[PDB]
Design a binder for this molecule. Structure first.
Ligand SMILES: [Cl-]
Ligand SMILES: [Cl-]
Ligand SMILES: [Zn+2]
Ligand SMILES: [Zn+2]
Ligand SMILES: [Zn+2]
Ligand SMILES: [Zn+2]
Ligand SMILES: [Zn+2]
Ligand SMILES: [Zn+2]
Lengths: 396, 49, 49, 396, 396, 396
């Protein structure tokens, strides 16, 4: 991985720095690294692609080196380097694609393709140089087993889940009490509804709770908490629990009461925020516990009093809500996120070449299934393919 | 089912069972299946004569 | 590979290229026989060997 | 700060570039810088303080120089360098944490911890090298009293405030007119509601205004403006101004009319946008003025006419919304935003070691309190701690 | 850890091989390694701390080298070596104890005692030699991020839980349908009971399902599956789910019908066994789904028909069972088993010296609580303490 | 086999002993053996896989020797040895997997994979060194036709069979006399039941006999014999012998009378145990004869006398039992047991790669089918694959 990353980085630096008119002092070290790469790859035969529709490609390297004494690079030097750069870029792109389309239950972190396995030989270690990207840095630290993490903007940590729970119900679904939530990406919208508006509840307070377990520990996370769940704020017709029938929801939004957000790690309360909205910080957690309450307004204007009678029928259903968006976080494991394109790259490569479904990843690289069952083996293979995808995107 | 998935061709039934001769379970399963492969014969689902 | 069953309760698994018996794999003969063409054994295994 | 940043940058470069097999030409300058740092730090005693639960730690530097004379770095070289780098990284992380948890009312831009004060001596200036990060670059600019610029994605510029204003009201709250808004992060949602649907208005037009005064000047801001405010488009029960009673809101959304978004700098109109939705550019501003109108539809189908009677009661209340999202911007002062982790890092470090509340920042590093009263002392201390946080995040 | 294990291994080899009359050629390499250990440890001061009732102990090393002059070892040589080995064994045992009684939430895999932290310095790497034990091999593999493996006989993977679920119940508990299970150690006994004997079932079949989620992935597992559950096959008086009353269970065991044992990994069926009893192999799994059925006998002898009437009362309650024992398995994470004595050693050391409860392990070193909430921090600390326990047991 | 085992053992020793900082005197002989391996394997082409989903893999060996002079091993030596060891371990794992998934009716003890057949040439005999494992030791001894012994904890010697024999029966199944047994793994539970409680039996004694024929001779066997068979001591609805109907069993357990356990070899009484319960030793046997009597209590209390009337109906049925557990044994042939993982390893390798059912082993490597028809060819193939599985387990 480090050798493949070094190949890609050398080629990117060759494209960027080997330009017409540049001082040779600007590229002396880069030219040395490029010539080392040519020297190491020369005389080696590579084969990439025998899986799905990825065609069998054979790579031979017999390229000449680059000059080292001129003062300023000219068009001749760049023309000489460009053909080698193109061939090497094609080779690296195909190696990255070959590695991205492979998985193993036993050793998912080890190279799977024949080409990357050959590049793990000792003789290719000479190609290795600066490993400065975030993903390669994490790769090396994690190989050494050092505390390292990835920074995500809008981490895709919650598998899709639109569900409801009815604590009070009956076959006619006319006097209900419960919670409905959407868990999607970095967003949690939860809404606790009481059809009776807590007329008969003790102290006229009804308590709703929502517990979300994250499949990986998020650290140094910035969260936006808002007191309304706009997703569950309009009339809906909702399938029953078993799909036997449909029930009617007619929300009237009351502000949530006694809002408490607890960020817990292994059942230990790490962060607690009471009646706090806006930006909050969750330093280290794997579980989110949202506790809110519906309180009857002790004083109601005539229209408000008309909304909530003493007994049934209940035509307007009192709802409180919360919205929790993870703006950014840090996680020791790789995740899909709104900023990076690693998951998109891997999925695109797998789909374009009809890669047969393996024994590790869900078919079609579905992220909801992947994050629902994010096992250590899946984490290993996902880190491998994501690092390869970043390496490839460095050039392609 | 005596197969990966359920099928009317691959279902075990009464088979009052014959303790007269030491019988393996596989033998009973195969005999029960063949007695329906006869209806396969008479359902145009055969290849040779 | 040929799987074979009989109403008499005799079953045989063997190879086409050379007629040597094979451990009969029930739950595979069933999946094969539910869908794939079924062949009457006019020249059944014993006679073939 | 520059010396601390240089330590962190040298250690990050050493971790990235000192890898087994790499050509020495790839690290010659890096090895020279690392040896310079070793020579400068050797023989010096440092102590990271015991503030809060942060442990007292003593650091002594007696390290040999990294070797030269290797064509390609080998495993022994990398092992020795890794031992030295590990010790130095631990020291740097502890110093950064010690500095992040301290503040002063006056001279808050200067180093607070003893370690960073010692590192600010002249004898350590040798360690200083490339200062390329945005935060260190802006630190240097500020030290030189030059123009500073921080680029934010979704700047956290609006303190949380969900409020309403009733321009026409009465105890019954059956015929109201006013505006209700939420200002959170980079988002402003506003909704002007008229319960009479401007039946008695001078020209069947009701004018609504919302002024949001930013507490720091934003420049080169791209803003998405959308017609409706979904936050205020569903039925609600809203406390009265003093909480004595609650009123009922039953919006029916009419499109906003004669929309007018003005971005003002020091009371001077810099940008104006009329009937423009989508992406707009506010080049330099510190105030936003949103003026919209509810125009009664001159023609109404029977269903529409049934919602807007000539007189009370008004069961359906006309509403015109507006959503304004600052997707990105540039500010001379540091701010929390979605992409960066500076605020989260500082808050996490303060919470982890139970740092007592200081005399500068609000308890818990609450961002709403911080930016509601973003004083120059707070700005100095926040820039200092954010720069230290970025320096630390380079290595942790 | 590797240095501590190397010390313990050297001392064990010295005890085993330095015997009266043995040829020096049988110990030449061992004597050289022992003398290297003497040289490395000489001049170093160590302290084993006073956590709990462990006495604070100070260790000084000023030992002369072992001789190399005798063709065959004699009594004097053995006695001198015995004195030195006794001191070193005392030191190693005390270090192992000091490490076992410590735990950390942040870095549990790193050494916690100051003695083992000092032994992790580079100068002690000379002591390191053959790492042939299973636990040290796995430690080294984990440090390199390689596929680890621990082979357990009767792995203690199921936390103790004797519970029942009543799918059909009533206040008088005379017409019940449900399941009762015991998941203890490597054993799962489950029993589905129907009081009506599926008289009114849709096809005279009552389906029972038990899902046991393993806390860690198990591989290469030999499992004995037997039809009946002897534990839930005799009359019982069982507390109600709320403890308000007691109900009577009077089983009559019927053969389980359509037994499907599924071994699932990430929800995917890795292994399936239909009506197969005896020894089976689950190659890789983390969940067990046992599906069985109570089928009403289509034909009954007069006594059997007498047991099961068409309506209540139901004095004999039909029951089907299943027993599942994991004879052996392989797990990447450490576990307690019936063969190894690591858990017993750690628990004994903690109890002997009255170690106060730490922040990681349950407050008895109780295996049920530990394996229940088997967090990654708990796993790291458990691996550390178990490795140290094996190192200590090499000597003590 | 010996060459493959020697490769695996050399690689295991290299992993365990070639570590950073260790004295070269600790590995001098190991380094010579490793170099001999390199010399012997150099210039040879190997191919593995091609059966089932096991992928085709080509191996070419061109590695330099380890000849660097040192006092203590350093990082360079360890890294070079690690690269070589990684390649060799991958090769050995693939060869072992290839050999495990193959079988032949004729000469199943001989190598099946072409890789192992090539490794069985004379030119590779140089690789051969210490053969100390139990399985390789037995392999070599059997090649020499010396007595071989595999020691099993809880040997899996009895194929699963839950059956019954009715010596007296009738269509109503209301007056039955017979025996029901479970022979599973190392456990034999047997229960002789008489519904009449020997009211009309000669001397009021009924005699039951259970003969169990072991498929292989067991020697030095430790057995635990217990009076009661808890599996056949609760009410039970059992199927008819031909499944036409179901009969009822309502045990009342009487202690077995005149218990004789005979361990026979070729029909000759080798061991005899009379009324002896607890731990017994069977030194050499291939058949077990459990003979026990149900004796009607000559004197009964009224409660006991109520259970056994002179004539029918017999509501309570007298039952005597015996439980026999083989805790440990020694067998010349290989078997599954509760402590080893070779059967599990072979089954996992065959299931993972979808190996087609071969001409020797039963589908899915069902142990019950294998041990029921444990033919000499099956024994040879099983020994081969188990030895290869142990060789692989040394590394993987
Ligand atoms: Cl965004
Ligand atoms: Cl056992
Ligand atoms: Zn964004
Ligand atoms: Zn419902
Ligand atoms: Zn009001
Ligand atoms: Zn109950
Ligand atoms: Zn019968
Ligand atoms: Zn055991």
């Amino acid at each position: 991985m480090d050798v493949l990353y070094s190949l890609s980085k050398t080629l990117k630096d060759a494209r960027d720095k080997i330009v017409e008119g540049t001082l040779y002092s600007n590229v002396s070290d880069l030219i040395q690294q490029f010539n080392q790469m040519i020297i190491t790859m020369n005389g080696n035969e590579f084969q990439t692609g025998g899986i799905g529709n990825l065609p069998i490609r054979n790579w031979n390297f017999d390229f000449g080196l680059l000059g080292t004494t001129l003062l300023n690079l000219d068009a001749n030097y760049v023309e000489t380097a460009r053909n080698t750069i193109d061939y090497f870029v094609d080779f690296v792109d195909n190696v990255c694609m070959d590695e991205m389309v492979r998985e193993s239950q036993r050793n998912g972190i080890a190279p799977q393709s024949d080409s990357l396995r050959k590049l793990s030989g000792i003789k290719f270690k000479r190609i290795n140089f600066d490993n400065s990207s975030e993903y390669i840095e994490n790769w090396n630290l994690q190989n050494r087993r050092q505390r390292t993490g990835f920074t995500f903007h809008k981490p895709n940590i919650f598998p899709y889940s639109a569900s409801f729970t009815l604590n009070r119900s009956q076959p006619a679904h006319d006097n209900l009490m419960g919670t409905m939530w959407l868990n999607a990406g970095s967003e949690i919208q939860v809404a606790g509804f009481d059809y009776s508006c807590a007329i008969n509840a003790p102290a006229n307070i009804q308590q709703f709770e929502h517990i979300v377990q994250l499949r990986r520990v998020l650290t140094t996370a910035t969260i936006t908490l808002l007191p309304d769940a706009e997703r569950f704020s309009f009339p809906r017709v909702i399938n029953s629990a078993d799909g036997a029938t449909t029930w009617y929801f007619n929300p009237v939004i009351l502000r949530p009461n006694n809002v408490e957000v607890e960020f817990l790690l292994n059942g230990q309360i790490i962060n607690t925020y009471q009646a706090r909205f806006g930006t909050i910080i969750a330093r280290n957690f794997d579980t989110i516990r949202l506790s809110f309450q519906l309180m009857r307004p002790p004083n109601m204007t005539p229209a408000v009093a008309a909304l909530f009678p003493n007994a049934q029928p209940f035509e307007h259903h009192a709802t409180v809500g919360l919205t929790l968006r993870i703006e950014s976080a840090v996680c020791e494991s790789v995740l899909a996120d709104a900023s990076k394109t690693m998951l998109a790259n891997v999925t695109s490569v797998r789909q374009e070449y009809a890669i047969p479904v393996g024994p590790v990843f869900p078919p079609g690289m579905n992220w909801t299934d992947l994050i629902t069952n994010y096992s250590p083996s899946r984490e290993d293979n996902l880190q491998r393919v994501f690092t390869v995808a970043s390496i490839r995107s460095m050039l392609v | 089912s005596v197969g990966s998935s359920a099928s009317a061709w691959t279902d075990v039934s009464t088979q009052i069972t014959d303790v007269s001769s030491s019988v393996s379970s596989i033998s009973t399963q195969t005999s029960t299946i063949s007695r329906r492969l006869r209806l396969k014969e008479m359902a145009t689902q055969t290849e040779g004569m | 590979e040929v799987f074979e069953a009989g109403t008499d309760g005799r079953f045989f698994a063997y190879r086409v290229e050379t007629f040597d018996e094979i451990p009969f794999d029930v739950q595979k003969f069933a999946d094969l026989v539910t869908d794939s063409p079924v062949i009457s054994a006019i020249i059944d295994f014993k006679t073939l060997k």
